[model samples]
Target: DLNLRLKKLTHAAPCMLFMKGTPQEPRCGFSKQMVEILHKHNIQFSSFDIFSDEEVRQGLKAYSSWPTYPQLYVSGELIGGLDIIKELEASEELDTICPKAAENLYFQ
Candidate 1:
């Protein structure tokens, strides 16, 4: 279920934010930055609260190769971490693919 859940989520939104806590109240700095980034872009998105699931947090690294909290997937593809995401925005990478990035940035 965890594996498919991740796959299902990536395709669920043009943008997906996997972060701790809710978007309205992100619990960490990295998670907060991603929320703001997407918000500023005026893109529609869905978010998952990673803090609520321990199994996903640890095993997602093997699935997505990311072990952090602010992973955003747009159209089922990695759009990168904070740095890559910002640069892509500046270069209008998302404009073409309209895609996104993540595993996480908290705990381990």
Candidate 2:
């Protein structure tokens, strides 16, 4: 069952945002902020609308072991939330951690 519905996370992109809403219409402030940050850095990524499913929303916490809505993943690994991402952005280390998805530098 998890695999059936869990298809939301493609993990195909270098960077992914499991945010509350889609980038076009964000449902939360933090979700929106992450979108902005990604755009500012021109990060090519993907996302799963957490608000679309209640089960996935709740189960993700345990699956990720992180109780947060705005979760960011780099190469299919949790990089932390807005707080951690903000720090990365400040220090200009985001690209190092998760290079632009467009470049596909890590995985061709």
Candidate 3:
């Protein structure tokens, strides 16, 4: 049941953000910060509130093989948790790897 929900959420949009809270209300600081970062970059994303679903909170870990909340996905690929996202933000690779970009930013 939960896995199915996660799968649906992951595929709901080209870029999905499974965080602790809804896009409007983030439960954790990291989740809030992540949202702000995406907003700053004008990246469009779909969000699943893990806090509202107990099954999702537990099942997502097994689904992604990642032991953390606020997981980010890009075109059905598990990018990573907040730390990795931060690194990507620093390296300026997140916009390229994720599908939220309006156009491909990777071309040389």
Top candidate, metric TM-score: 3
Looking at model 1, residue 106 earns an lDDT score of: 79
Clashing pairs in 2: none
> 22 in model 1: Cα distance from truth in Å?
1.5
Q: Is candidate 1 or candidate 3 better by lDDT?
A: 3
lDDT of 1 by residue, 1-108 (tens): 788976876677777777888889999988888778777776678887888877777766568887665777777887666777788778887555554344468786
- For candidate 3, what is the TM-score? 0.84
Tens-digit lDDT string for candidate 2 (27-108): 9999999999988987878888988888888887777888987998887788999999899999999767876744546664
Evaluate model 1: give its lDDT: 0.74
User: Model 3 over residues 1-52: C-alpha lDDT tens digits?
Assistant: 7777778878899888999787788989989988988887677788888878
Model 2 ranges off by over 4 Å? 3-12, 101-108
Ordered by lDDT, highest first, the candidates read 3, 2, 1
Write the number of the candidate with greater TM-score, choosing between 1 and 3.
Answer: 3
Q: Which of 1 and 2 is the better model by lDDT? A: 2
lDDT, each prediction:
0.74, 0.82, 0.83
